Subunit: 278 residues, 3 copies
């Protein structure tokens, strides 16, 4: 493999994070005050890393940080029940850990932390974060295994109820690549509805990485994936591989959802920057 | 050095009843007056045969239908095939299981092993809609030789918008000690899709919920979409890498968790305490 | 393996197809005028094959052909946006390609096209084909890998909203086999609803082929599979294996759906043609 690959983990990392009310009534996470986003910023670590997150709640209601997949003690689970949320104006340090896979004392195989995961609020509106998730308090987390192939770019697509990334219907988001780029997609679902994520012109493996290890990998190859609230998966594709440049739609394939605006464009450009037809 | 399942091939006999419960629910049991919702766990090894003498103590027809396991049409539990049971009647159902292996044509026949379930097929409608709603469902585990055995098995059924037909916000809660090998059988019934989530723990999305080793490509998840009659299971080490605590499990459909589809996996320290209580 | 198996692909194939309004208001695809069907005809190719489809729209509204899984250039994506649909009475040639898996220049493993796929309209009623799909413009596509086991027969089961193959409730379809037949099912979902496909007396592997490669195959074995709009999977079973002859139900296991008529029969006959009980 002459693609770039992830190194062995084991670093201690520190991060500052905020929750902020946005002017339009949404709520977002950010690494810097005044720079919150929906979805929140991507967090990327290597198996074995530890992450300490000093989280400041700048809002006038309690809020928290809850993460899927990664190791955390009960004091970092982000729930009111376990006294793990954060009062208005307060600050709390959360700790997320990750571990490599390996053989247990009893001979069984402990799975590693690697995967496409996500974080979100757990106390805004209800004790399950229903109002916080609705308002935009969610973001992606990637844990890489040593040797995983690294992409040119990562895009995050969140089906939150009947919106993509809390955007107005029929406003994408769109993103751009050049034929041949290695593009990574993190796909997260939140809210009340099931969805089916579909991409024109591209396909991926329904496994941890979205990639086949080789000719022995039995994972199915798909272009359409059912998802429900708090499901997270990811994959990498070679933009335009075997199909060329174009305005490649991605959308939820539930027909009513598609018709109501759950559609975006994967704009794959020729080496001269053009898109066939535009 | 964990305990593992032996090779199967025994003929087993079981008595089972369907009973109307005082509150209007219906449940299966191994003994009259000891019916439960979910019904009792049935556990066999690949190659075993199970003969179930089933007695319907209710005033309506009822049946037993099973997923995954081999049965002849006379044991499919449907009215169509005359395998339901009249009120007060008794019928012997036979379920079989087989090991995987090579067919004459060189193809690979899959075994019966898996996390399965049984349920009524004739109460209320000819698809068991009323019987399932009333509580006539239960788990079945078929083990492959060499499968790792747990310390304890718990059954979690999302039946419409309830867990195990319980009132909203009443669990069920389960208890373990840090380090216990805990097995979960997860079954869905009714009209709704759900997403099963556990705080602090994760499992492999494959037959056993466990990876065979470094080559196992199965994804590792903590959130699984499920629909009516889906069944899966897994094993976790309670509190592994995360410690003791009151660990929530719930459906992650936001309205469903808000409406009460939540329980607690109470993982105790060796002194019996739960951090915070 | 002394079963029949798929050969290596790499042929250029040509096909004529039509879209046709049916007397009852449905719309169907066909290989010949007056022989349209819902589902449309099965298209079956080998990895490496190319397929040129000369598609004629005989209807009074625009219509198109969009395919999942297979390689196509943007000019064959079947969307209005990319000028890829067909005006009333018009004709257009679509090209679908397939490729085998293999090693990329960077050492990564490119997945092949093989799988259980499907095609459908993309412009009737809305720009996502909502009206065309509703009316019956969908059909199965199988791409075989060299060495794949070939069945005795293939049946296509489409959960389209709350119908099977657009049929009236409680009218099947029913299929017939003899104990020991190798039967292939292509299972496609369309519309607005999620479903769970269940077959009495039989089970399959939740992987690309529905079959285990051997004792090392980790895929789960199931008899109940959740599906959403534009999901497609398939499998092979040995009719009556270990269970014998009988009227074996298949249905959606959503209780309201089976009660409302999403039920059919897999009629597995003894060598004398009878079905136990009839
Ligand atoms: Cu939670
Ligand atoms: Cu959707
Ligand atoms: Cu498409
Ligand atoms: Cu969550
Ligand atoms: Cu049934
Ligand atoms: Cu739910
Ligand atoms: Cu969680
Ligand atoms: Cu069932
Ligand atoms: Cu589309
Ligand atoms: Cu259905
Ligand atoms: Cu069944
Ligand atoms: Cu489609
Ligand atoms: O959660
Ligand atoms: O069933
Ligand atoms: O589509």
């Amino acid at each position: 493999i002459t693609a770039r690959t992830a190194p062995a983990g084991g670093e201690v990392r520190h991060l500052k994070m905020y929750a902020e009310k946005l002017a339009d009534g949404q709520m977002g996470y950010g690494f810097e005050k005044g720079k919150a986003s929906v979805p929140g910023p991507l967090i990327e670590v290597n198996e074995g890393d530890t992450l300490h997150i000093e989280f400041t709640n700048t809002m006038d209601v309690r809020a928290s940080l809850h993460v899927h997949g990664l190791d955390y003690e009960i004091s970092s689970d982000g729930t009111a029940m376990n006294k793990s949320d954060v009062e208005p104006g307060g600050t709390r340090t959360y700790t997320w850990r990750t571990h490599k896979p390996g053989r247990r004392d009893d001979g069984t195989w402990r799975p590693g932390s690697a995967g496409y995961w996500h974080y979100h609020d757990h106390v805004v509106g209800t004790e399950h974060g229903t109002g916080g998730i609705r308002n935009g308090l969610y973001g992606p987390v990637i844990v890489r295994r040593k040797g995983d192939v690294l992409p040119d770019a990562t895009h995050t697509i969140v089906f939150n109820d009947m919106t993509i990334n809390n955007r107005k219907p029929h406003t994408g988001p769109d993103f751009e690549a050049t034929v041949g780029d290695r593009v990574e997609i993190v796909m997260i679902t939140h809210g009340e509805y099931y969805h089916t994520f579909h991409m024109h012109g591209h396909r991926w493996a329904d496994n941890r990485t979205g990639i086949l290890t080789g000719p022995d990998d039995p994972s199915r190859v798909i272009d359409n994936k059912i998802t429900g609230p708090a499901d997270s998966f990811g994959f990498q594709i070679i933009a335009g591989e075997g199909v060329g440049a174009g305005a490649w739609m991605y959308h939820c394939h539930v027909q009513f959802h598609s018709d109501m605006g759950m559609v975006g464009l994967f704009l794959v450009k020729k080496p001269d920057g053009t898109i066939p037809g535009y």
